[PDB]
Write a protein that binds this ligand. Structure first.
Ligand SMILES: Cn1cc(Nc2nccc(-c3ccc4c(c3)CN(C3COC3)CC[C@H]4NC(=O)c3cn(C(C)(C)C)nn3)n2)cn1
Length: 265
């Protein structure tokens, strides 16, 4: 049921390369757009991912990039997902031609927050939430992508909290200090994502290295208000960065807060 026949795929354009190698745009059965991850040899814990894929198939939300199936009888294995015509949110934000209105930026936050409230309701962690792991469709809707996949990455530079690819700038102090992941580390990352959206894709802590960032966060330094964020919007993103994880909100509370600011606005 989770298996797609790779003979049903037509490959049409290369999208780029991520942690697991090349991703392509194609058609399924001559008709339906898909994205196809071609998993590079050595990059993924494949047997564990294949077992988890059964669970991921049943995650379905309008603001989550849908997993359609896997092709596992051959190597490389393929992961087939919903196709998002406008690519990753980070690059979308950096395209100044869009001249975004702050109401559009708030709606991007709401899109992500609805997806994360859904994953929270299933006790499912994203584990690498960030604008680079969200995607944008042809209607400008933002959806959350590649949730949970961090668990199957074999590259130590990504897994090690001091590795060159670890998401230091999206991590709370208890992750940096103790590798304590929880719902509340996804919360922290979501606040950084809101900051990315309102900063039109600037790098968080852009004047600092990863090592310096970890030191400053531990000492209580925080990101500060982006020029395009109202005071009420900044209060929501800042609430995600309480030092004490248990003082951070849930995604349900964050969603209610975002909807309130939409009414103000
Ligand atoms: C340009 N573009 C793209 C579309 N559409 C579209 N639609 C659906 C999916 C995709 C897509 C999804 C993921 C990735 C790419 C594409 C390739 N992408 C390149 C740079 O930007 C093109 C790099 C990132 C890659 N990340 C991973 O594979 C990945 C990462 N993780 C971790 C969580 C870090 C473990 N796990 N999997 N792209 C339109 N234009």
């Amino acid at each position: 049921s989770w298996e797609i026949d790779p003979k049903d795929l037509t490959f049409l354009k290369e999208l780029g390369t991520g942690q697991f190698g090349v991703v392509k745009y194609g058609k399924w059965r001559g008709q339906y757009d898909v994205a196809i991850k071609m998993i590079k040899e050595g990059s993924m814990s494949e047997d564990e991912f294949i077992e988890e894929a059964k669970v991921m198939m049943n995650l379905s939300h309008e603001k989550l990039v849908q997993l359609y199936g896997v092709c596992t009888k051959q190597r490389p294995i393929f992961i087939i997902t919903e196709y998002m015509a406008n690519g990753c949110l980070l690059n979308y934000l950096r395209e100044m031609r869009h001249r975004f209105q702050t109401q559009q930026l708030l709606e991007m936050c709401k899109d992500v927050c609805e997806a994360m409230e859904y994953l929270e309701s299933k006790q499912f962690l994203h584990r690498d939430l960030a604008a680079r792991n969200c995607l944008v469709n042809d209607q400008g809707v933002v959806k959350v992508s590649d949730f949970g996949l961090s668990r199957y990455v074999l590259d130590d530079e990504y897994t090690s909290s001091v590795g060159s690819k670890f998401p230091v700038r999206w991590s709370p102090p208890e992750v940096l200090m103790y590798s304590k992941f929880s719902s509340k580390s996804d919360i922290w990352a979501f606040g950084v994502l809101m900051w990315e959206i309102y900063s039109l894709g600037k790098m968080p802590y852009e004047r600092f290295t990863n090592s310096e960032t970890a030191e400053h966060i531990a000492q209580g330094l925080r990101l500060y208000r982006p020029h395009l964020a109202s005071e009420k919007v900044y209060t929501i993103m800042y609430s995600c960065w309480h030092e004490k994880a248990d003082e951070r909100p849930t995604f349900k509370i964050l969603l209610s807060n975002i909807l309130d600011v939409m009414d103000e606005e």
